[PDB]
Amino acid sequence: SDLPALSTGLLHLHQNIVDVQYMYGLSPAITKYVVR
């Protein structure tokens, strides 16, 4: 149903992570929060 292509699985997965972890990553933020 819908998505008459099925040729964009890994591509969609990358956008899903690059569009969520970019805002919920805080990798460098936590490194400067526990020591300051």
Side-chain angles (χ1 to χ4, degrees):
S1 305
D2 298 276
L3 239 298
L6 239 100
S7 283
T8 48
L10 273 163
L11 192 138
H12 277 212
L13 199 79
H14 171 82
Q15 274 276 283
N16 200 98
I17 292 158
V18 169
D19 187 63
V20 174
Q21 240 294 94
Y22 100 89
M23 228 262 102
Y24 282 88
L26 284 110
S27 3
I30 294 300
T31 303
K32 256 65 110 278
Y33 252 126
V34 178
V35 80
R36 193 120 274 147

